[PDB]
Amino acid sequence: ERVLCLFDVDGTLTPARQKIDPEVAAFLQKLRSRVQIGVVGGSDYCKIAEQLGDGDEVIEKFDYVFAENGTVQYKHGRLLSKQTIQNHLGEELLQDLINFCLSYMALLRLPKKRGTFIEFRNGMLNISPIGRSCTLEERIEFSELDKKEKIREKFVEALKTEFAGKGLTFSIGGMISFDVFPEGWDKRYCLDSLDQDSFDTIHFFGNETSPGGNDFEIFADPRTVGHSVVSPQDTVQRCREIFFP
Ligand SMILES: [Mg+2]
Ligand SMILES: [Mg+2]
Numbered sequence: 001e002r003v004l005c006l007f008d009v010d011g012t013l014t015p016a017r018q019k020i021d022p023e024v025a026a027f028l029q030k031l032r033s034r035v036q037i038g039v040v041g042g043s044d045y046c047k048i049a050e051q052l053g054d055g056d057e058v059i060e061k062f063d064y065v066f067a068e069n070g071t072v073q074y075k076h077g078r079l080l081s082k083q084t085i086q087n088h089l090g091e092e093l094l095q096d097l098i099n100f101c102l103s104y105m106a107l108l109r110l111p112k113k114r115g116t117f118i119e120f121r122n123g124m125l126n127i128s129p130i131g132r133s134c135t136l137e138e139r140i141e142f143s144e145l146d147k148k149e150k151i152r153e154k155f156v157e158a159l160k161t162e163f164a165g166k167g168l169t170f171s172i173g174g175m176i177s178f179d180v181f182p183e184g185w186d187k188r189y190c191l192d193s194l195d196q197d198s199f200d201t202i203h204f205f206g207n208e209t210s211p212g213g214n215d216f217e218i219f220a221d222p223r224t225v226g227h228s229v230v231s232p233q234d235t236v237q238r239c240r241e242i243f244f245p
Contacts, residue, residue, distance in 0.1 A: 003201045004194070005031065005239065006064070006224070008187075008215050009041040011207035013232050014051050024232045025052075027239070029061065034243045036199075038064030040190050042173065042214060044121065045072055069181075070190025071123025080193070082122050088182050093166065097180065100162060101127055104155060111145065112138055123189070124181035129155065132177065143175035152178050173214075187218035195223065205229050205238070 010016040013024060028037055039058075041048050045067040052058040058074075059065050065074035073080040086094050098118060105117055114131030126132065129151055130142040146152055156170045156178055169186070171179040194202060204224040206215025219226040229235045 002199050003035040003203070004038060004064070004197075004199045005035050005203045005205065005243075006038045006040060006190075006194075007204075007235065008206040008208070009039050009043070009048060009051060011231070012205050012215075012229055012235055013039065015232075017047075017051070019051050021232060024236060025061070027236045031239055031243060032063075035203075036063040038062055038066065040066040040070055040187050040218070042069060042179075042187075044068055045074070064190075064194075066190040068121060068123045069185055069187050070193065071185060073190070073193060075193075085121075085123055085125070085182065089167075097125070097159075097163065097168065100159065101125075104158060105129055108151070110151075111141065114138070119177075123185050124179045126177050126179055127155070128177035130176050134176070139175045146175070171214075186214060188221055191218065191221060191223050201225060203227060203242070205235050207231075 007013050013028075014020045031037060039048065039052065039062055045065070048065065048067050049056055049058045053061055059077050063076060066072070067074075071085075072082050101118060108129055110130055112130060112134065114133045116132035117128055119126040119128070119132055130138065134142070152172050156172060159168075159170060159180070167183045169181055169183050173179060191202075202224045204215075204218055204221075205227045206213070206219055207229050208215040209219040209226060209228040210216065215228075218224060219228070227238060229238060
């Protein structure tokens with residue numbers, strides 16, 4: 001009787017980094033008459049809020065809003081607290097990681113550098129060799145240089161080796177940055193809080209459920225019924241089959 005559908009945002013519910021089609025959002029609300037619904041995204045809260053309504057309408061349209069993989073949580077309109085990356089990792093390791101990064105980037109010579117090479121978020125560190133504060137034209141410029149030169153990839157190889165065995169995971173999401181977060185702090189992080197909400201079934205939907213994609217772990221977890229989708233339209237049809245047959 002208590003079921004939750006939980007959705008990746010990008011490519012599952014919305015075109016990536018863009019806004020949800022009204023027909024999609026309309027279906028979701030209809031679906032809500034049979035199940036609770038929720039979203040989990042890698043992005044921070046405001047980015048998700050923007051794709052999924054006006055202002056803070058997102059926390060109203062969805063029963064659960066897990067931003068930054070669930071290190072930041074909204075449940076039934078209310079913001080829950082957040083375990084901090086430094087609390088979990090401790091100051092010594094966090095700073096070891098940070099100092100490794102500053103040192104590596106100091107030796108990097110790029111066409112352009114800007115600011116915010118290291119962004120401190122709730123559940124990860126976003127590392128960006130060009131600097132997060134560049135224009136779109138500068139994103140594209142660096143992005144093309146990165147493919148040629150594999151700047152982020154090399155950086156991530158060096159980081160992985162250096163911190164081997166120490167509990168860190170790395171990404172490479174987008175044109176200019178990569179993420180660093182504690183082992184476990186992928187999308188699965190949200191499931192722990194969900195465990196205390198007594199659902200009989202948690203269905204997960206994603207578009208990156210293949211090995212490597214950021215939906216894989218949450219998709220494969222024994223706490224969720226996994227579904228793999230290719231489009232928001234695919235997602236909608238899938239829910240039609242399962243919940244409106
Ligand atoms: Mg996606
Ligand atoms: Mg599963």
